[PDB]
Amino acid sequence: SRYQHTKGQIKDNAIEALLHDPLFRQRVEKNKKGKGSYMRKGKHGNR
């Protein structure tokens, strides 16, 4: 239930300190077509 963040002590700010935690990291969606949209087999490889 309790999220274990990666900073021992927390001073002056809670929400802002969690902002620089890997819980709130940027999530980049791997696009389906275009740049960086190549796959070996993908999801179902039947040929």
Partner: protein
């Protein structure tokens, strides 16, 4: 139909949220259980219990007794003009006008309960907005979330003052500090602490794909004028003794050194720099004035650190609203308010995201 009668159904719209939140049936039913608790002869032997309850029954009054009369007026205020518009009785037409002010002021009596949560509601506050890492997209959204509330603060009549600022290397900002000035500044924005969530197709990346970036907006009043050194000499035991002795017969005879021992705390403050007792007194009073105030700054931080300990364990519960602009949808994940009006949200349409957010919070 009638702007008067539809207004009554709009007071109903404001009432039903308060009906469902505090559970005015169970909130009412709680009173009769504590009536029998209070109606008792052996409650005088626990006067602290009855004093804590004697106003607790009154706290249940302004919530229940307001809503108990409020449901009656919904048919009453609507039914008065309904009979007045048939006979065209112009006085009875004007009689139901003040009847519109009957339940609304009672709704304003509950507006006290809406702003009851807080001890610095009418205080002026700061709007500190920090950006997540996210590359440049997070740098831009901090600016996009800045003007989100900067447009809204001026949309309501509050004075907006930008104190600090930090711009982006490429585009956007990094961490702006706005000080909202005026009364009820911290009261409305109290439900704005917490990280905001953005989901959109990022234009900064070349092969632009959907980035899920975050931004936090911590608010705090920071308004005080009370600083207590507690330099009251009823405390501060003073102890005078003689020095080590290097100046012959004189310094071994003169009780020049001094110690300042605090009576409640127990920290000692000695000083034997100069040669006079009058001179070492002020320096030892100065060092005691430092070490006592710096003890107060740690107790200020000790309660502050314990305050964050109820906030660091939350984790993925510090998210406030999800701005998923790829499908044009807004999600206030705290309460559950979904809106499809993202072009109007950036104008500051967060009044729906306060009435649902603050009364339920």
């Amino acid at each position: 139909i009638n702007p008067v009668n539809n207004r009554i159904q709009d007071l109903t719209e404001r009432s039903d949220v308060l009906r469902g939140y505090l559970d005015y049936d169970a909130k009412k039913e709680r009173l009769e259980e504590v009536n029998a608790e209070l109606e008792q002869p052996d409650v005088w032997n626990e006067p602290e219990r009855a004093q804590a309850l004697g106003k607790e029954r009154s706290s249940l009054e302004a919530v229940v007794d307001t809503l108990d009369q409020m449901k009656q007026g919904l048919e009453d205020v609507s039914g008065l003009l309904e009979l007045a518009v048939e006979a065209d009785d112009e006085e009875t037409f004007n009689e139901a006008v003040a009847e519109l002010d009957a339940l609304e002021e009672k709704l304003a009596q509950l507006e006290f309960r809406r702003m009851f949560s807080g001890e610095y509601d009418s205080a002026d506050c700061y709007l500190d907005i920090q950006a997540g890492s996210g590359g440049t997209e997070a740098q831009d959204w901090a600016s996009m979330l800045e003007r989100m509330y900067l447009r809204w603060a001026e949309s309501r009549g509050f004075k907006t003052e930008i104190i600090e600022e930090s711009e982006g290397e490429v585009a956007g900002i990094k961490s702006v500090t706005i000080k909202i000035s005026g009364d009820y500044a911290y009261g409305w924005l109290r439900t704005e602490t917490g990280v905001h969530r953005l989901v959109r197709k990022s234009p900064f990346d070349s092969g632009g794909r959907r980035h899920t970036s975050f931004s936090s907006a911590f608010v705090y009043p920071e308004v005080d004028d009370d600083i207590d050194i507690e330099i009251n000499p009823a405390d501060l035991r003073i102890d005078v003794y003689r020095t080590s002795g290097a100046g012959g017969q004189h310094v071994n005879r003169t009780e020049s050194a001094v110690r300042i021992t605090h009576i409640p705390t127990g920290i000692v403050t000695q000083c034997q720099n100069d040669r006079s007792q009058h001179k070492n007194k002020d320096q030892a009073m100065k060092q005691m004035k430092a070490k006592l105030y710096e003890l107060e700054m740690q107790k200020k931080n000790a309660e502050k650190q314990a305050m964050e300990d109820n906030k660091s364990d939350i984790g993925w519960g510090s998210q406030i609203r999800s701005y998923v602009l790829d499908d044009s949808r807004i999600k206030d994940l705290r309460t559950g308010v979904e809106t499809r009006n993202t072009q109007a949200v950036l104008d500051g349409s967060l009044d729906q995201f306060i009435e649902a957010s603050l009364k339920a919070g």
